[model samples]
Target: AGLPESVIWAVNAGGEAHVDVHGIHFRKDPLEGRVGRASDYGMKLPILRSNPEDQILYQTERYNEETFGYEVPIKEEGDYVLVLKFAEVYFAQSQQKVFDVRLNGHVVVKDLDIFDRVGHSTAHDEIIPMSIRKGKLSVQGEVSTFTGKLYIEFVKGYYDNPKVCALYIMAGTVDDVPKLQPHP
Candidate 1:
């Protein structure tokens, strides 16, 4: 698979569930999940959003229009890793698209400006290590928690829509993996 080996479940946002990309199988929106539509504007290549011009990650699916949410159901609750892939392909400049991410009603990303943070036409990946305790969810030491459903909410920010290309939910958290640095 071309994607990271740690990825257990991956999706191409607006497309159908369960697709093969370069031998890597990616599921469409989960049956219990709600998604918006597909976008075909930004750089379609792959890259890393570490200050841009290096790693290029792109996707055609973006959650826009009404409030977007994804509910990923898991069999058992434990420590799981959630990786969100993002790229600014539609908007021409910064602040064109902005949004906030809430996991189990807890704010994980606030006032997110993709173009501003990652630069125009770049890609960014966020690795969230969350602990599910007795069917509850916690991120960055904060716990709002839930049962069965790994609920994620994306709300509009300064702009009209918030967008995400892909998502990965794995069994265990990867501690040694490099975490995304905060934008200054």
Candidate 2:
């Protein structure tokens, strides 16, 4: 198949359970031994408090001890997009919680500062273009492939552990990726 569907899959990272919002089925964290929990403090109302798709802010996954991520399987084979969602709900300041993310064994986002970029509780998304070919998920313009699974890893950092609110895997280009819904 050229692509499985417009939207491939999604998951609520630190969610205690699963929920479907904004027409996307965000599954609960499936990895064993998870340490998912809510954010750090109350929201600052002056800025954008919550987005159209906002339930996930209360349920996020964080890995304190070691690097952690997902091994989601993809049935279709073609260009794909990866969206990483996060909010620095715990730290009041920037460097208090900095981390990096990896895809297919390569670092896609290095030194991500949620608070520094958008402040606490603000909806943040890092959209990346990727590919799944011959059976593996690879960065754009690569020569090799692995098992028919996508490798997503959050590298632990000295500042703090890695945290994520949700993950969005799309089947096409960034143009097709869902935009952060407007706050209601």
Estimated TM-score for each candidate = 0.74, 0.79
Q: Give the CA lDDT, 0 to 100, for residue 161 in model 2.
A: 80
**Which segments of candidate 1 are over 4 A away from where they belong?**
1-6, 16-24, 30-35, 43-57, 176-184
The residue-level lDDT of candidate 1 at 37 comes to: 65
Candidate 1 structure quality by residue, lDDT tens digits, 62-158? 6667777777777766667787878776566766777889888888888888778777556677777887777566788886647677777888665
lDDT against true structure, model 1: 0.66
Segments of candidate 2 deviating more than 4 angstroms: 1-5, 16-21, 32-49, 57-59, 134-137, 140-143, 181-184
Each candidate's lDDT (Cα)? Answer: 0.66, 0.67
The sequence of per-residue lDDT tens digits that candidate 2 reaches over residues 10-117 is 776655444444456667667535443434233333224444346454435545557877888788788878888776656778678888888877888889988887
RMSD of 1: 4.9
**lDDT for residue 146 in candidate 2, whole number 0-100:** 68
lDDT for residue 142 in candidate 1, whole number 0-100:
81
Q: Candidate 2 at 73: error in angstroms?
A: 1.0
**Top model by lDDT, which number?**
2
